[PDB]
C-alpha cells in the first residue's frame, strides 16, 4: 500500500542519474512516482522552489524521521569549507540568509534517514568529479560518512549513469525489507557496498563476444567484426549485468556499440583510462 518516501539530493552531479531513472520501464516513471515512491524533494522536477522547497524537504525529514530514503546523486566536495557546492539558502527567523553546502546538507539529512542510497559512481565512489586533477576535495558518500563518523545504512548503486533497473530494483528491495525484514532480507552487497543482484556478474565472462576473444578474433577498428578488447574494452575488469540486461529497454549496450569503459567500478575513471587503450 504505502509508498517509499524519498528525498533526492544533488551534489557534484550531472543530473544523468536522474535522467537515467526517467528512462525506467516495468515500471515506467509515471508508475514509479504515483505508485511506488513518494518523491518528496527533487531539485530537477519538483513544483516548489527556494524557501518553500527547502522547508518542505526539512518538514518531510522531520515527519518521516527514520522512515525516508536519502538518495544522493553526485559527489561531495570538501575543499574550501564545502563552498564548491551550495545547495540552497535558509532564511532564519530574523531575515538573515545562510548558504547550505553539500557537506552540511548530507551531515544534516543522513542521520534523519532510514537509509542512504548513493546512486551513480559520483556519489558511490567519487567518479569523475573526484578524478585526477580536481581541486574540490571531491568525496564519495562512503568516505564522507567515514570522515564524519556517520553510521547509517548505506547502499551504493553505481554506474555513470546506473541503469534504471539497478536503481529501481535496489530501492524496491530496500523498501520491501523495511516492510517485512524476515520475508525480504536486504540484498547481499559486495565489498564496495553495491548489490550482487546487479553487480555480481563479470561483464567479460558473460559477454557474447567471448567466443571471438577465445579465438583471438579482435576488431581492428570499431566497425570491424571481433571482440572489442584491442579497442579498449574494460569488460574483463568490470562487474555489472549489462551483457544480460542491455540498455534503454534492450535497444543496445556499450560493448556491442563500442567498448565498456568500466563505469560502475570504484576506480572509474582513472583506473579505466585511457578508455581506448586495451587493459
Amino acid at each position: 500500500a504505502k509508498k517509499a518516501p524519498v528525498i533526492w539530493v544533488q551534489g557534484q552531479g550531472c543530473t544523468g542519474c536522474s535522467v537515467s531513472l526517467l528512462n525506467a520501464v516495468h515500471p515506467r516513471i509515471k508508475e514509479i512516482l504515483l505508485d511506488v515512491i513518494s518523491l518528496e524533494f527533487h531539485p530537477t522536477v519538483m513544483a516548489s522552489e527556494g524557501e518553500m522547497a527547502l522547508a518542505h524537504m526539512y518538514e518531510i525529514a522531520e515527519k518521516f524521521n527514520g522512515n525516508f530514503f536519502l538518495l544522493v546523486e553526485g559527489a561531495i566536495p570538501t575543499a574550501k569549507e564545502g563552498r564548491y557546492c551550495i545547495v540552497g539558502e535558509t532564511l532564519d527567523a530574523k531575515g538573515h540568509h545562510h548558504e547550505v553546502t553539500m557537506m552540511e546538507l548530507i551531515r544534516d539529512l543522513a542521520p534523519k534517514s532510514l537509509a542512504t542510497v548513493a546512486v551513480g559512481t559520483c556519489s558511490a565512489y567519487g567518479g569523475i568529479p573526484a578524478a585526477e586533477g580536481n581541486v574540490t576535495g571531491s568525496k564519495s558518500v562512503r568516505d564522507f560518512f567515514a570522515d564524519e563518523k556517520i553510521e547509517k545504512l548505506l547502499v551504493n548503486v553505481p554506474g555513470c549513469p546506473p541503469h534504471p533497473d539497478w536503481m529501481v530494483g535496489t530501492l524496491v528491495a530496500a523498501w520491501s525489507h523495511v516492510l517485512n525484514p524476515t520475508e525480504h532480507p536486504l540484498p547481499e552487497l559486495d565489498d564496495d557496498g553495491r548489490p550482487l543482484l546487479f553487480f555480481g556478474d563479470n561483464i567479460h565472462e558473460n559477454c557474447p563476444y567471448l567466443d571471438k576473444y577465445d579465438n583471438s578474433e579482435f576488431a581492428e577498428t570499431f566497425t570491424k567484426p571481433g571482440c572489442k578488447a584491442e579497442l579498449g574494452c574494460k569488460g574483463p575488469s568490470t562487474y555489472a549485468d549489462c551483457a544480460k540486461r542491455r540498455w534503454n529497454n534492450g535497444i543496445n549496450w556499450c560493448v556491442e556499440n563500442a567498448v565498456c569503459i568500466g563505469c560502475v567500478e570504484p576506480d572509474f575513471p582513472d583506473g579505466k583510462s585511457p578508455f581506448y587503450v586495451a587493459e
Binding site: 544533488q10 557534484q12 552531479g13 550531472c14 543530473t15 544523468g16 542519474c17 535522467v19 537515467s20 526517467l22 528512462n23 520501464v25 515506467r28 509515471k30 512516482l33 504515483l34 513518494s38 518528496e40 531539485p43 530537477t44 522536477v45 513544483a47 516548489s48 522552489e49 524557501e51 518553500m52 522547497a53 574550501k80 564548491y84 557546492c85 551550495i86 545547495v87 540568509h97 548558504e99 569523475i128 568529479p129 585526477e132 586533477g133 580536481n134 581541486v135 574540490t136 555513470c160 549513469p161 577498428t221 570499431f222 566497425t223 534503454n248 529497454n249 535497444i251 543496445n252 549496450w253 556499450c254 556499440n257 563500442a258 567498448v259 575513471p269 583510462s273 585511457p274 578508455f275 581506448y276
Partner: protein, 489 residues
C-alpha cells in the same frame, strides 16, 4: 520601497542555481544570477589521452551529453587531422538529433510546465505557490479551465514516455543514453543497418506525431492564455549561434546557420571575438581584459572579493548575447510549422510565415517557449530527411593517430545554445581544454564593466504583483532552459 527576493534552489532547471531580484512598484528592478556548484572538468581533463575527452565531457551534463560529445569529437577530428565520412556525419546527426527532441520535450513538460499546469495533489507536484497564476486560475470559464489544464497535464504525463522513446532512438546507434559510446574521433562506432534504421524511424514517427499533434498546439494555446508573457522577459535582444547539424561533408552548411544579431543588426559569427570575463566570477585570470577561449584559464577561487558565481561571463565584441532556440531561430529565420502558421492566425490574429514575423514577441518568456517548440518541429523534419539519407552498411569510422602537438575546436549548438570545445595537445596529451557552453552565455553574472548577463537583464521589468508568489521570476528563468552543470563544468 524595494523588496529583495532570493530563490535558492531555483528548481526545475538542471543543476544548482540561485536567483536574487529586487522588486519596486510591482516589477523587478535588479537581478543577480548565481551558479553555486563547480567540478572543474577543464582541470580534470589535463594530462589525459585526448580521445578520453569525448567520454569525460559528457559527464558535464546528463541532459545534453550528446552535445558535449559532438563538440569534443569534432575538436578531436580537427586536432587529429581526420575527415569524417558522409555516413559518419549523418549517423552523428541522428544520434544527436534524437536528443534534441528529448531535451526540448523534457524541458517544456518536465521543467517548465508546472509553472502553468496544476498537477495532482501528491509530491512532487505539491507543495506549490498558493497563488500560482495557473491555467486553473487564469481561465475564468471553469469547465474550460479544467479541460485545458487536464489537456496540459495529460501531455506532461504522456511526454514522460515520449522522451524515453527519444532515448531509445539515441541508443540505437549511440549504445546507451545518458552518456553515449557511439561517437568518437573519426566518426561513429556502429554502422547503421537497414533494420536498425527502420526501428529508429518507427520510434521517430511516434515522437514526431506527438510534436505536431500535441506539443505545438499546447504551446500556441498556452501563449493565447498568457498573452502578457509575450510582453515581458525581454533582455538585451542580442543573440549568437555557431551552426548545428552539418548538412554536407565540408561543414559549410547547417540545418541552423551560424550568425550574430546585435543591436538590431545581423553579422557573421567570428570566433575570434569571443572572450570570457571573470570580474564577478570565482576565478583568477593571469591577465586583465577578458580571455579568448584558446588561451582560457581555469583557476577557481571561491574567496575572490566581489565575485558571486562559478559561471564565467562570455561576451561577443564586449556585448552580452543570449543563446538557444530563440537565438538559432532568430538567426536562421526559418518558415514556421503549419501548426504555428495556423494557430497564430486562429488564436492571436497574427499573420506569420517566418520566425521573425513574431517580431518583438520572440524576445519574451513565451517567445522562448515558442522558439523551442518550433525548433523541435524543424529538427523532426530534418531527422525525417536524414533517415532517408543514411546508407545502411556504409562506413562510419575512419582511423586516426593521436598527434604529438595540435589544436582543434569543435563548434555546435547544444539544445540550450552555442557550444564549443577547444582542445590543445602537447606530447600526445591534453595540454589545455576549454569549454564555452550554452547556459554559460545565458546565466552568467555581470562582466568587469557591470553589464548584466542575459537572464539577469531579461529579469528587469518582469512583473511581480505578489511578492509572496513571485511566479514570473521562475517563469522567465525557466524560459531559457538553464543547465548549470553545463554553465560551470
Amino acid at each position: 520601497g524595494k523588496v529583495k527576493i532570493s530563490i535558492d534552489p531555483l528548481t526545475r532547471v538542471e543543476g544548482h542555481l540561485k536567483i536574487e531580484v529586487e522588486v519596486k512598484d510591482g516589477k523587478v528592478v535588479d537581478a543577480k544570477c548565481s551558479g553555486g556548484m563547480f567540478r572543474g572538468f577543464e582541470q580534470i581533463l589535463r594530462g589525459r589521452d585526448p580521445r578520453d575527452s569525448s567520454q569525460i565531457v559528457q559527464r558535464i551534463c546528463g541532459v545534453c551529453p550528446t552535445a558535449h560529445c559532438t563538440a569534443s569529437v569534432m575538436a578531436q577530428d580537427d586536432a587529429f587531422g581526420v575527415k569524417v565520412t558522409t555516413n559518419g556525419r549523418i549517423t552523428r546527426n541522428l544520434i544527436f538529433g534524437a536528443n534534441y527532441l528529448q531535451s526540448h520535450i523534457l524541458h517544456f513538460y518536465h521543467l517548465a510546465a508546472l509553472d502553468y499546469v496544476k498537477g495532482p495533489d501528491v509530491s512532487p507536484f505539491v507543495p506549490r505557490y498558493a497563488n500560482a497564476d495557473l491555467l486553473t486560475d487564469r481561465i475564468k470559464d471553469g469547465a474550460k479551465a479544467d479541460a485545458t489544464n487536464t489537456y496540459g497535464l495529460n501531455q506532461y504525463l504522456k511526454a514522460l514516455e515520449i522522451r524515453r522513446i527519444c532515448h531509445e532512438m539515441v541508443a540505437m546507434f549511440g549504445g546507451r543514453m545518458p552518456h553515449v559510446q557511439g561517437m568518437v574521433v573519426g566518426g561513429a562506432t556502429e554502422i547503421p543497418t537497414a533494420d536498425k534504421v527502420a526501428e529508429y524511424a518507427a520510434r521517430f514517427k511516434e515522437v514526431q506525431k506527438f510534436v505536431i499533434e500535441e506539443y505545438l498546439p499546447l504551446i500556441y494555446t498556452l501563449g493565447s492564455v498568457y498573452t502578457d508573457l509575450f510582453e515581458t522577459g525581454i533582455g538585451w535582444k542580442n543573440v549568437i549561434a555557431f551552426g548545428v547539424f552539418p548538412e554536407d561533408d565540408d561543414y559549410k552548411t547547417f540545418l541552423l546557420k551560424p550568425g550574430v544579431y546585435i543591436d538590431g543588426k545581423d553579422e557573421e559569427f567570428d570566433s575570434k571575438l569571443v572572450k570570457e570575463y571573470v570580474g564577478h566570477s570565482f576565478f583568477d585570470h593571469s591577465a586583465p581584459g577578458g580571455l579568448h577561449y584558446s588561451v582560457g584559464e581555469t583557476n577557481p577561487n571561491p574567496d575572490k572579493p566581489g565575485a558571486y558565481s562559478f559561471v564565467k561571463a562570455p561576451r561577443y565584441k564586449d556585448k552580452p548575447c543570449e543563446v538557444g532556440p530563440l537565438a538559432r531561430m532568430w538567426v536562421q529565420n526559418p518558415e514556421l510549422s503549419p501548426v504555428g502558421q495556423k494557430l497564430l492566425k486562429e488564436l492571436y490574429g497574427i499573420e506569420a510565415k517566418n520566425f521573425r514575423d513574431l517580431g518583438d514577441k520572440a524576445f519574451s518568456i513565451m517567445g522562448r517557449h515558442v522558439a523551442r517548440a518550433e525548433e523541435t518541429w524543424l529538427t523532426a523534419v530534418a531527422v525525417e530527411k536524414w533517415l532517408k539519407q543514411v546508407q545502411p552498411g556504409a562506413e562510419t569510422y575512419v582511423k586516426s593517430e593521436i598527434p604529438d602537438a595540435a589544436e582543434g575546436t569543435g563548434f555546435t549548438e547544444a539544445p540550450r545554445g552555442a557550444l564549443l570545445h577547444y582542445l590543445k595537445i602537447k606530447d600526445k596529451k591534453i595540454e589545455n581544454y576549454q569549454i564555452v557552453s550554452a547556459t554559460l552565455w545565458n546565466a552568467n553574472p555581470r562582466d568587469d564593466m557591470g553589464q548584466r548577463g542575459p537572464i539577469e537583464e531579461a529579469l528587469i521589468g518582469v512583473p511581480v504583483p505578489d511578492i509572496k508568489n513571485p511566479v514570473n521570476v521562475g517563469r522567465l528563468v525557466r524560459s531559457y532552459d538553464p543547465x548549470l552543470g553545463c554553465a560551470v563544468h
